[PDB]
């Protein structure tokens, strides 16, 4: 045998979130061995008018179904009343209630190792950022069970009445290169089922980038300043770092500008680097190295090209 089950559905809205002029609720009594059944509707506990609801019983095979539809106006449905559908099955009554749909949303971002931290610096770090927490324990994990280097948990509340928890986990050099996977989970007193943020190596293949460096000609009225444009394209995936070098010393990131990686016409991504130089720099040494750090480059994940 099989006892019946009860479910309630409401009418849908439009693209603008507008309720229809007549709101309709449905009470499903599906999947039950044929037997005596009677549906009764309630409004905050009171039995509604019998002429407002219609009940149709359909029998299919060994199970039975019973449908009950109720048409209400928008003013009555917007009253936030508790409408209970009480269906009786041979003495066993099942109930279910509904009401008009009346906080803040949690989010989390887990950054990936930057090419500078993994190959040039040699101290790769990931950042598990969790935002929009109600101000009132972080739990890291690894996929291979290897010894997890501990992280610094920086818990700081935000200005919008929320809380942010920054967790920077140091990882190994060879581990991320060989495709290690890490996961991040935070626990809060008001959490029944926590969420998970898992970072790993990119699913796509690898392709070394091609670096071309050009020097803009002297523009009329700008004899003491040149612009250096560097094109780096056809590299997969898009995670790449760019830096410039003059006189064997690396320039800060504020002196150059790099665009976001965008797809090429076929396969790979392309970026553009723009460095502004003065006449004292190229007369000191007319050589500027446009260096690109990518996981697919080799041997030391580095590809460069100079321009005069």
């Amino acid at each position, epitope marked *: 045998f099989t006892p019946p089950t009860v479910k309630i559905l409401q009418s849908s809205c439009d693209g603008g979130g507008h309720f229809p002029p007549t709101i309709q609720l449905l009470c499903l009594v599906s999947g039950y061995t044929p037997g005596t059944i009677q549906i009764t509707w309630l409004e905050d506990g009171q039995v509604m008018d019998v002429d407002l609801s219609t009940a149709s019983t359909t029998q299919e095979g060994e199970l039975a179904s019973t449908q009950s539809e109720l048409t209400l106006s928008q003013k009555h449905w917007l009253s936030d009343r508790t409408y209970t559908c009480q269906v009786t099955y041979q003495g066993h009554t099942f109930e279910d209630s509904t009401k008009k749909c009346a906080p803040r949303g949690v989010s989390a971002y887990l950054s990936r190792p930057s090419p500078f931290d993994l190959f040039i610096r040699k101290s790769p770090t990931i950042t598990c950022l969790v935002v929009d927490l109600a101000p009132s324990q972080l*739990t890291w994990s690894r996929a291979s069970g290897k010894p997890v280097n501990h992280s610094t948990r920086k818990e700081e509340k935000q200005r919008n009445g929320t809380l942010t928890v920054t967790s920077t986990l140091p990882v190994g050099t060879r581990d991320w290169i060989e495709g290690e996977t890490y996961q991040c989970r935070v*626990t809060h007193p008001h959490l029944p089922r926590a969420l998970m943020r898992s970072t790993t190596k990119t699913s796509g293949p690898r392709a070394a980038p091609e670096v071309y460096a050009f020097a803009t000609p002297e523009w009329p009225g700008s004899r003491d300043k040149r612009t250096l444009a560097c094109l780096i394209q056809n590299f997969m995936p898009e995670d790449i770092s760019v830096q410039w070098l003059h006189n064997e010393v690396q320039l800060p990131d504020a002196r150059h500008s790099t665009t976001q990686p965008r797809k090429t016409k076929g396969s790979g991504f392309f970026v553009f680097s723009r460095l502004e130089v003065t006449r004292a720099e190229w007369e000191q040494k007319d050589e500027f190295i446009c260096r690109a750090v990518h996981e697919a480059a080799s041997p030391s994940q580095t590809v460069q090209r100079a321009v005069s």
Partner: antibody, heavy 120, light 111 residues
Framework: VQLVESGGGLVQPGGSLRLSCAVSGYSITSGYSWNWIRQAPGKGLEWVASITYDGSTNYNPSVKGRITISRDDSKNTFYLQMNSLRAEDTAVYYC??????????????WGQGTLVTVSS | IQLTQSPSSLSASVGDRVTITCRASQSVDYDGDSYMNWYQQKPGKAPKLLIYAASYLESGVPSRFSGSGSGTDFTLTISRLRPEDFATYYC?????????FGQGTKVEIKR
């Protein structure tokens, strides 16, 4: 990577059987979990053995005491020697690999599975 | 830790939805998460990993599979039914020892 088993066949009751599993593609000493899972003919599955990269082992309550499992770093292969074989011990042994998750494992890679029939 | 699934054998039409319930006598919700796994054992081959922690899909598994539940009761949902899914399905728990598998569900197709 792939997990291939070897060493099955026919063994007399109570005897000793040595089941091996030669992994391919990943060094067994690089950090992972390697388990043994058996399945009775026509019944469900059951775990029995486990071994990590550093040497930590564990044994299921239904088969503990009759089982000896060890690893070999030189051949990327770990064995399962088992004594006191019973009639209800006949099962298809699968060499599987698990993945870590906050101290809980799940078998990702599954071997080809070898059938060991204990009878007279 | 006894586990059970239902039903045993069912015949469903091509393209329908399938519901499997892995009922456990042990609440596995710990550390703010649930630890329950699902598997697909093709007939006469090695079981295939589907869902881990009863919520997250295995990398490479099609989107037809969807798992739900927490604590003691879990539910499995199939979106669209393809003939490629004829197999027996078991659920494995890794919360506490001994690690136990389900009873199995032989899902065959009606056509």
């Amino acid at each position: 990577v792939q997990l291939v088993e070897s060493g099955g066949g026919l063994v007399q009751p109570g005897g000793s059987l040595r089941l091996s599993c030669a992994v391919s593609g990943y060094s067994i000493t690089s950090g992972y979990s390697w388990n043994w899972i058996r399945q009775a003919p026509g019944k469900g599955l059951e775990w029995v053995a486990s071994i990590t990269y550093d040497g930590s082992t564990n044994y299921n309550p239904s088969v503990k005491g009759r089982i000896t499992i060890s690893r070999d770093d030189s051949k990327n292969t770990f064995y399962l020697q088992m004594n006191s074989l019973r009639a209800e011990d006949t099962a298809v042994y699968y060499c599987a690999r698990g993945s870590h998750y906050f101290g809980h494992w799940h078998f990702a890679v599954w071997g080809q599975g070898t059938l060991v029939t204990v009878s007279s | 830790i006894q586990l059970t699934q239902s039903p045993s054998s069912l015949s469903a039409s091509v393209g329908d939805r399938v519901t499997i319930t892995c009922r456990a006598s042990q609440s596995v919700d710990y550390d703010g998460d649930s630890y329950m796994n699902w598997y697909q054992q093709k007939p006469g081959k090695a079981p295939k990993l589907l869902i881990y922690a009863a919520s997250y899909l295995e990398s490479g598994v099609p989107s037809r599979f969807s798992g739900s539940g927490s604590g003691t009761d879990f539910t499995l949902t199939i979106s669209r039914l393809r003939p490629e899914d004829f197999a027996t399905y078991y659920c494995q728990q890794s919360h506490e020892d001994p690690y136990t598998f389900g009873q199995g569900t032989k899902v065959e197709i009606k056509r």
